[PDB]
Amino acid sequence: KQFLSENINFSNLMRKNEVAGFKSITDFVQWENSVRLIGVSLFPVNYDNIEFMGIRLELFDELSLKYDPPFYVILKPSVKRLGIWELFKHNLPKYINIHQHWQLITKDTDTSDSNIMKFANLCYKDLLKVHSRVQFFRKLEGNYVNDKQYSLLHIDNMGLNVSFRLGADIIKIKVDDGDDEIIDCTFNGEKNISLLGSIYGITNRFQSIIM
């Protein structure tokens, strides 16, 4: 019964007794790997005397095209407030403010399937501002602009600070969420207002314009 994999690897979705009401355990895993693609997912951790509720958070990476490993946030059935969920064990980056999102939604009072979907979507969102923002600098590797190559030198965890070379000169940058705005730039070491405008439109289209 091990056709279910932890990562959402692409093969499970394709090729070719009632389980779930579905045809067969294969045709269930095709449906489950389908849904899960959305990047956000709800799935049970089941034990004989208890059931935790997990939250799948999965990013799609376009470099090698595959998903990154699922991140889990897990919720324990509560006590002292009797029929509601409470936060349990989370592995998520330290940049995602997990707890400030729990309170913003449930206020700890009402934890409802309706409100928990709103909870992930808030975490997952903060997770894709960061990933999508780093990745945009990875995707440019090898690309020319103004017929000068771009290689990337360094980028930090969450990608506010970056250094790339563009065809022999080093541009440094600093960014401010969630504007994804460029607040500072150093061109070959001296102050630069040109590239400043924004993290996307302006760092291709405005790289050609002045400099």
Partner: protein, 197 residues
């Protein structure tokens, strides 16, 4: 009665048992059960409001009478080619899927079609709550009208991320409404903007 090798989750249920004990023998020694039944009921309440289905190779996402068909090709183990078809929503959603289908980025496609249907249900029940709560009338999803005044409701995208944010416009004045939605909040502000002006 199947014992699952998940192997991240199993490394997590162990960790914080161990990370809170760094504070000075907390190891599980027991693995969870798997029962497709509950697992499905969970995948259900996550899609709630919309069905996923498959007629190979394409996989359909459907909220009633709307079909976003994603045909996908995989050459192991990596995706290669993604393609898409919608109905009636081509325009509203266009900008985000320009990106999606253009990177062959799949989850950005899905999660955006999901959150568009959700911002569409939000506006439709937001506009209901406004029309019965004051003197206003409706034209489509987009628009409501009071006398000479026309207020449109619809979503825009910050192109990278699949989450749409809301945009409430009107024939001028703009500065005024926009601020009464912020301070007094999207319903009570768009009620107030149908009194002063």
């Amino acid at each position: 009665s199947v014992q699952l090798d998940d192997k991240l989750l199993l490394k997590l249920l162990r960790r914080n048992d161990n990370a809170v004990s760094d504070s000075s023998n907390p190891l599980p020694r027991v693995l969870p059960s798997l029962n497709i039944e509950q697992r499905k009921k969970y995948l259900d309440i996550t899609l709630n409001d919309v069905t996923v289905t498959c007629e190979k190779d394409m996989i359909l996402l459907r909220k009633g009478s709307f079909t976003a068909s994603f045909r996908i090709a995989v050459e192991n183990e990596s995706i290669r080619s993604m393609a898409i078809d919608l109905n009636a929503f081509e325009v509203e959603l266009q900008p985000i899927i320009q990106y999606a289908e253009d990177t062959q980025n799949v989850n950005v496609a899905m999660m955006a079609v999901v959150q568009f249907l959700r911002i569409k249900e939000l506006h439709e029940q937001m506009i209901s709550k406004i029309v019965e709560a004051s003197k206003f009338i409706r034209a489509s999803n987009n628009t409501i009208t009071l006398n000479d005044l026309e207020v449109s409701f619809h979503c825009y995208w910050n192109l990278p991320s699949p989450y749409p944010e809301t945009l409430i416009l009107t024939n001028k004045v703009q500065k005024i409404l926009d601020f009464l939605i912020y301070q007094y909040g999207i319903q009570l502000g768009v009620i107030k903007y149908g009194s002063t002006i």
